[PDB]
Design a protein around this ligand. Structure first.
Ligand SMILES: C#CCOc1ccc(C[C@H]2NC[C@H](O)[C@H]2OC(C)=O)cc1
Ligand SMILES: [K+]
Ligand SMILES: [K+]
Ligand SMILES: [K+]
Ligand SMILES: [K+]
Ligand SMILES: [K+]
Ligand SMILES: [K+]
Ligand SMILES: [K+]
Ligand SMILES: [K+]
Ligand SMILES: [Mg+2]
Ligand SMILES: [Mg+2]
Ligand SMILES: [Mg+2]
Ligand SMILES: [Mg+2]
Ligand SMILES: [Mg+2]
Ligand SMILES: [Mg+2]
Ligand SMILES: [Mg+2]
Ligand SMILES: [Mg+2]
Ligand SMILES: [Mg+2]
Ligand SMILES: [Mg+2]
Ligand SMILES: [Mg+2]
Ligand SMILES: [Mg+2]
Ligand SMILES: [Mg+2]
Ligand SMILES: [Mg+2]
Ligand SMILES: [Mg+2]
Ligand SMILES: [Mg+2]
Ligand SMILES: [Mg+2]
Ligand SMILES: [Mg+2]
Ligand SMILES: [Mg+2]
Ligand SMILES: [Mg+2]
Ligand SMILES: [Mg+2]
Ligand SMILES: [Mg+2]
Ligand SMILES: [Mg+2]
Ligand SMILES: [Mg+2]
Ligand SMILES: [Mg+2]
Ligand SMILES: [Mg+2]
Ligand SMILES: [Mg+2]
Ligand SMILES: [Mg+2]
Ligand SMILES: [Mg+2]
Ligand SMILES: [Mg+2]
Ligand SMILES: [Mg+2]
Ligand SMILES: [Mg+2]
Ligand SMILES: [Mg+2]
Ligand SMILES: [Mg+2]
Ligand SMILES: [Mg+2]
Ligand SMILES: [Mg+2]
Ligand SMILES: [Mg+2]
Ligand SMILES: [Mg+2]
Ligand SMILES: [Mg+2]
Ligand SMILES: [Mg+2]
Ligand SMILES: [Mg+2]
Ligand SMILES: [Mg+2]
Ligand SMILES: [Mg+2]
Ligand SMILES: [Mg+2]
Ligand SMILES: [Mg+2]
Ligand SMILES: [Mg+2]
Ligand SMILES: [Mg+2]
Ligand SMILES: [Mg+2]
Ligand SMILES: [Mg+2]
Ligand SMILES: [Mg+2]
Ligand SMILES: [Mg+2]
Ligand SMILES: [Mg+2]
Ligand SMILES: [Mg+2]
Ligand SMILES: [Mg+2]
Ligand SMILES: [Mg+2]
Ligand SMILES: [Mg+2]
Ligand SMILES: [Mg+2]
Ligand SMILES: [Mg+2]
Ligand SMILES: [Mg+2]
Ligand SMILES: [Mg+2]
Ligand SMILES: [Mg+2]
Ligand SMILES: [Mg+2]
Ligand SMILES: [Mg+2]
Ligand SMILES: [Mg+2]
Ligand SMILES: [Mg+2]
Ligand SMILES: [Mg+2]
Ligand SMILES: [Mg+2]
Ligand SMILES: [Mg+2]
Ligand SMILES: [Mg+2]
Ligand SMILES: [Mg+2]
Ligand SMILES: [Mg+2]
Ligand SMILES: [Mg+2]
Ligand SMILES: [Mg+2]
Ligand SMILES: [Mg+2]
Ligand SMILES: [Mg+2]
Ligand SMILES: [Mg+2]
Ligand SMILES: [Mg+2]
Ligand SMILES: [Mg+2]
Ligand SMILES: [Mg+2]
Ligand code: NA
Ligand code: NA
Ligand code: NA
Ligand code: NA
Ligand code: NA
Ligand SMILES: [Zn+2]
Lengths: 258, 89
RNA sequence: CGGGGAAACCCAGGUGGAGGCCUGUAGCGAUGCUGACGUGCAAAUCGCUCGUAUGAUUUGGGUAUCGGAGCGAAAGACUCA
RNA sequence: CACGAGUUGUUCGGAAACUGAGCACAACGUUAUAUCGUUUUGUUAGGAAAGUGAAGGUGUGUCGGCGGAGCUGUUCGACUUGAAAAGGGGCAACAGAGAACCUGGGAUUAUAUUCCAAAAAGAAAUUGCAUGUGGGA
RNA sequence: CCCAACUGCAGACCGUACUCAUCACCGCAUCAGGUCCCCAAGCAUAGAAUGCUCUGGUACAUAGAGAAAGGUACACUCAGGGAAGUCGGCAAAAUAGAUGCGUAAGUUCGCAAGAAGCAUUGGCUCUGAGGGCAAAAAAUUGCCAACUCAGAACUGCUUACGGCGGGGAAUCCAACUGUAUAAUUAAAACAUAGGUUUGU
RNA sequence: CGGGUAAACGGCGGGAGUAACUAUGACUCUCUUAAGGUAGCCAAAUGCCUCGUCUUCCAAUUAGAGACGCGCAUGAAUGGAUUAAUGAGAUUCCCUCUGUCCCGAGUUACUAUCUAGCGAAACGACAGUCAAGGGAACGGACUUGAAGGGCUAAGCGGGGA
RNA sequence: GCACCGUCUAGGUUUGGGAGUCCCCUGUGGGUACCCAACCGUGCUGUAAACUGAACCAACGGGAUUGCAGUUCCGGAGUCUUGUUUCGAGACAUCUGCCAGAUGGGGAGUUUGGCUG
RNA sequence: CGACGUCGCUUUUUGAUCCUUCGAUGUCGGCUCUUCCUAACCUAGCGCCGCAGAAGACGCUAAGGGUUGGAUUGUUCACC
RNA sequence: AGUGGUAAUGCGCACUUGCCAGGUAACAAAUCAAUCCUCCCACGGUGAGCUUUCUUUUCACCAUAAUCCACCUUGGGCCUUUUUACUUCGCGUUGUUCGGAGCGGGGGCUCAAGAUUGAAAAAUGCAGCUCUUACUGUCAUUGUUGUGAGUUCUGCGCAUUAAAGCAAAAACCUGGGGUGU
RNA sequence: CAGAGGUGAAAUUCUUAGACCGCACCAAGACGAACUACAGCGAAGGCAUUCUUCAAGGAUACCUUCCUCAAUCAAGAACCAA
């Protein structure tokens, strides 16, 4: 046979990110000494759109804590952030939308975004538009904070990890029907080369396991094992169930005993 | 005189794409092109300049919020919760 | 901007110039004549006819992905007849 | 076909001298084998890759003021103590960025914003050095 | 030592001919194929349609003689009938611009629709309407430019350049715009928006 | 081994009797499956029989449409049914229109044709009139007959399997 | 056992101690309301609803070499290091190699009789 | 005209065979055009009949001449 | 050791790459106005064509490069003043607007496009010709209108459908500090 | 530790892989028992924990105000358990 398309994309080549016209990675400011013991005051300078990303981005100007210069960090803007707003990041920052606080300084039930999975990773959770985390509780004995992720999973992280108060801007994007192939064309123009999508049963058997036949059909079950090698692992990978979901959509992902 | 009966801005699509998908998009299309109240400066001059970006013509302020409306309903509740939790401390 | 109405709102004129909208050049294609030619002008061309022609549009240069591999809106198509 | 000629630039295009999609020298790692891999999400490499230099001190040269051509102190350029500057060297656009000239000619067989000579047919614009004048030091 | 207006001297390197195509490049060739950019006149006309023309270019593509049959054509016509032809209306014929009136079922209310259908159109000589600027009920007084539309009388047609939809009633398939077997298949195939599922 | 899962792959019955004429079978019995095809749709681009049967369209209908359904072998995201608009998609009918036809005729340009100049290729065992006969069962050669004076121009498609 | 290494602090609360309102015109200008100790605290001069500012290349004070100025150190700017850059995890993990077994058309190689009206 | 039987002819059907052709003999149908056969539909004669007439049946000699336009179907056939 | 104006900002006022901050480079639809130029008119000069008859006619030409000096038309931003500017409002576009977060009016500041005067520059170019050969001299002309039609230069962007929001850098410019002090 | 569930009686079902039962907890979504009545509020539909809030609504009180502004209705409009 021939290499399946899903495996061909692992080489990169013409399937990589369209990174041109992007402003760069969006991150919180570095977890420095001022963040750990006091706070840093920044000014929102602009709210900008980046190609391929639904959420708005914010350019926040800080003073250098050690040198005579400005920093101008770029982070994912929560909803309601505006130009000229003062942003407080650190241990002593007040609980307000747009401020970045240690998770241990945030009350139960507060809605947070841009959450650090590990302390100092500059924000890795709840970053897509309209997404947020909910703080369940803190445990002062082990210094861990429990939060509910946007997918419904519950995760515990160190209390020293930082979170931004609020929800990510740009919510409701998916609720507008696209209505046109051309509109899908422009949506993926800024992301990567992954559209349009050709069905596996529409390909030839040399290319896909689903290809071939005098009728367009999958002649074998489409649920495949987790251990199947690349090129064989197409269809519904390691599916626990199939068909219409009735009476409640269970939380997807792998079970974590914590 | 009124130029269409049922569809408004959706009349640019002619007979394509189906009535129900057009109706669902019409509600967001109308809101994303409308003037929203600016809490600053007290004007109805907020316009969308990209998905999630709103700039007021009156005071030139730029605000991040909502793909097709200035403020999502979830943000209004979140704003109230944060202020409530701030007063509790 | 007229005309109605208690209200909700409705009916009339104009302005404006939207659209993977229509007719139609260039451009990009190739439906039929199963036309011409078929030791051809041509190892695929010619004529008329025909599709589309603000868009998922056409095009120059540069750059990136290849041989059991590449690439493919998927015809086993294309990768210097 | 044979013989003999023709292409003239401070300003035109390129380079000197920009970055882009990208490339891959060094470095490191890998491979029996480098003819392999990483090398722009601000950016090489377990990684000591800056030879550049504020300010001073110390001499020289151009000045200044003071009191008695010299003396002290002082300004600014040359020669000899070390703040701060993280992230090696390069290529990739003759349609992107950049770029100080443009008319007349009786000036050719053929080149010309490229040739024309004192009435330059002429009128300019720009760099790099200098000299003198004017003014500050 | 540093500024201003001058002035003096010096401004290095490579490219530069010609071509860019129905003869200069690729296609074995001076091959009706292919090949990016700039400047682009007059009249008709909606006009980069099409037709003809000043400037510039060209008469180079083997010619002469010349009503055999049979051919090819970016050439026509045909009485009476009018699809009886043929697998099949293939091919050809047909419609035709502009303006006024008018237009069904169905429908996602957007369309269908140029639906279908009637009518007018020339040339001449006129008449109205549609403006600008200037001057102390200026609701007038002067001067003047570009055109368009409408309405009359008179006078015509041999229906007469080019260009330019035939229409209607239904079934099957695919929603649609698109893509796609370079060189026998453009489709109902692929894509598509929409829907669902899986892993995380 | 024990649970889950079909918008996973897929699958979704047979016989017998029965209603005041007859037919039919609401009803009943019985054999059996994981479940026995539900809503719908159809001689459909899916029906063998098959040019099914009825109505309509025609003077005449293996065609088209509308009905019917024991469906060889229809059927629900292996998506079912419907559907305005759209289509160089497949099909039937009507108006218009015509050299498509009855049934052909006339004309034009460029050829063919003749000339000047120039000048190939394919193909080529040897050759080249027939009848019958036998024969490797379909001869240009052989047998027996019948033809046949030689050389040429333009055509033509019977043969040269 | 004792003693050394080995120690300094913002701020908060409350125990001892000593020690200096004045000029110019009701107004204006300048200036004084401190140190020590204990307890907590733990390295702490700014914000507790947000709408866009500036901040560098130190003043200053001591100790030496009235005041003032040179060359200096000292602190202003706490000190120390049985040493890890910091954080999370952690002697497990597939983290590294080796051995072993299942699964494995993803892929490779090969085969898929004969007679025959 | 002809049951039960029986003797033939033909090569316009299919089957049987595998002689020719697999370094290739262009496949169905239609269109067009010519010729040939006769087992005679019409046209010329002639017999016979359950032959009155009319219309027909059967048979003989004779292939000179003629043998149509359409709907459906790719059809050959078929049917109207 | 800069300086004027209430102000918008004006003036020919030193050094700054130690350092820092901004800007230019730097991007964008459509509508409507439209530049240089092109084409048409109108009027007028010069030469040629037609001229049995007509034709105050037909055709051609009537050109002004960079670089500089001086300084009324439109469009935008802004300043000052009057703001008793919006109670059953006003200004403006073809067009979707705008205003006590300061509309309109008076007077101004500034930016961008162009007028206009002049230097260059007639000494050039073009056409016809006198003289008489030398690719000779002499001489004549040497233009303006157009509410005409085109024309993307420009006005024009925080500037387009947008789940599309439209490169970067060198180089340069200005300021904040500082130096001069 | 050997049954539990369920019914007229049963069985489908759960259970030594520990069901049922017992105690204190955790999560999530409903609901607001008793008090609850020929009781209250609302135009009807409807409405039941507490606290903090925002607009209303009725009755009563008045030597306030005012001066026929009203009753009921096609058309039209709003609300309306499941
Ligand atoms: C399918 C099928 C049946 O129909 C055919 C049709 C033609 C042929 C070709 C043969 N005919 C004679 C010779 O043997 C071959 O000729 C050639 C040129 O190969 C075979 C079968
Ligand atoms: K793609
Ligand atoms: K298949
Ligand atoms: K693609
Ligand atoms: K390499
Ligand atoms: K395709
Ligand atoms: K054969
Ligand atoms: K007879
Ligand atoms: K238990
Ligand atoms: Mg590869
Ligand atoms: Mg697909
Ligand atoms: Mg296929
Ligand atoms: Mg396969
Ligand atoms: Mg399918
Ligand atoms: Mg399928
Ligand atoms: Mg339009
Ligand atoms: Mg279109
Ligand atoms: Mg079209
Ligand atoms: Mg079309
Ligand atoms: Mg072309
Ligand atoms: Mg052909
Ligand atoms: Mg031929
Ligand atoms: Mg075309
Ligand atoms: Mg290769
Ligand atoms: Mg295939
Ligand atoms: Mg030569
Ligand atoms: Mg030579
Ligand atoms: Mg990388
Ligand atoms: Mg790069
Ligand atoms: Mg590098
Ligand atoms: Mg690195
Ligand atoms: Mg380069
Ligand atoms: Mg080039
Ligand atoms: Mg360039
Ligand atoms: Mg140059
Ligand atoms: Mg030349
Ligand atoms: Mg040259
Ligand atoms: Mg040249
Ligand atoms: Mg050219
Ligand atoms: Mg060549
Ligand atoms: Mg070659
Ligand atoms: Mg043309
Ligand atoms: Mg034209
Ligand atoms: Mg000519
Ligand atoms: Mg030629
Ligand atoms: Mg010729
Ligand atoms: Mg020729
Ligand atoms: Mg002929
Ligand atoms: Mg017919
Ligand atoms: Mg026929
Ligand atoms: Mg037929
Ligand atoms: Mg046709
Ligand atoms: Mg209707
Ligand atoms: Mg049907
Ligand atoms: Mg389609
Ligand atoms: Mg289209
Ligand atoms: Mg199409
Ligand atoms: Mg493609
Ligand atoms: Mg093809
Ligand atoms: Mg084709
Ligand atoms: Mg499909
Ligand atoms: Mg669907
Ligand atoms: Mg199930
Ligand atoms: Mg059924
Ligand atoms: Mg059926
Ligand atoms: Mg069968
Ligand atoms: Mg028919
Ligand atoms: Mg039917
Ligand atoms: Mg089936
Ligand atoms: Mg089925
Ligand atoms: Mg199903
Ligand atoms: Mg013979
Ligand atoms: Mg032959
Ligand atoms: Mg022939
Ligand atoms: Mg396998
Ligand atoms: Mg295999
Ligand atoms: Mg065998
Ligand atoms: Mg036989
Ligand atoms: Mg045989
Ligand atoms: Mg042959
Ligand atoms: Mg042979
Ligand atoms: Mg043959
Ligand atoms: Mg006979
Ligand atoms: Mg006969
Ligand atoms: Mg005969
Ligand atoms: Mg810009
Ligand atoms: Mg209660
Ligand atoms: Mg309900
Ligand atoms: Na990338
Ligand atoms: Na050619
Ligand atoms: Na089509
Ligand atoms: Na032979
Ligand atoms: Na013989
Ligand atoms: Zn505002």
């Amino acid at each position: 046979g021939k290499t399946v398309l899903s495996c061909r994309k692992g080489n990169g080549s013409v399937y990589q990110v369209h990174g041109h016209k992007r402003l760069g990675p969006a991150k919180l400011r570095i977890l420095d000494y001022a963040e750990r013991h006091g706070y840093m005051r920044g000014v929102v300078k602009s709210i900008e759109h980046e190609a391929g990303r639904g959420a708005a981005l914010a350019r926040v100007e800080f003073r250098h804590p050690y040198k005579f210069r400005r920093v101008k960090e770029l982070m994912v803007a929560p909803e309601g952030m505006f130009t000229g707003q003062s942003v407080f990041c650190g241990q002593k920052a007040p609980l307000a939308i747009g401020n970045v606080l240690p998770l241990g300084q945030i009350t139960e039930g507060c809605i947070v975004c841009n959450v650090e999975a590990k302390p100092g990773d500059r924000g890795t959770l709840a970053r897509a538009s309209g997404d947020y985390c909910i703080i369940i509780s803190h445990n002062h004995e082990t210094g861990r904070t429990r939060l509910k992720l946007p997918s419904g999973q519950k995760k515990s992280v160190p209390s020293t990890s930082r979170a931004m108060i609020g929800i990510i801007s740009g919510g409701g994007r998916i609720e507008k029907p696209v209505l046109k192939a051309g509109n899908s064309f422009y949506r993926f123009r800024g992301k990567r080369n992954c559209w349009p999508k050709v069905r596996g049963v529409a390909r030839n058997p040399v290319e896909h396991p689903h290809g071939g036949g005098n009728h367009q059909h999958i002649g074998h079950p489409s649920t495949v094992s987790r251990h199947s090698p690349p090129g064989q692992k197409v269809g519904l990978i390691a599916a626990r169930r199939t068909g219409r979901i009735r009476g409640g959509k269970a939380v997807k992902g792998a079970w974590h005993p914590e | 005189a009124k130029r269409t009966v049922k569809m408004g801005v959706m009349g640019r699509y002619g007979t394509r794409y189906g009535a129900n998908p057009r109706k669902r998009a019409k509600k967001l299309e109308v809101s994303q092109h409308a003037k929203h109240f600016c809490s600053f400066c007290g004007k109805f001059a907020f316009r969308r300049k990209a998905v999630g970006i709103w700039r007021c013509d009156g005071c030139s302020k730029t605000v991040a919020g909502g793909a097709y409306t200035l403020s999502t309903p979830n943000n209004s509740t979140v704003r109230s919760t944060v202020r409530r939790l701030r007063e509790l401390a």
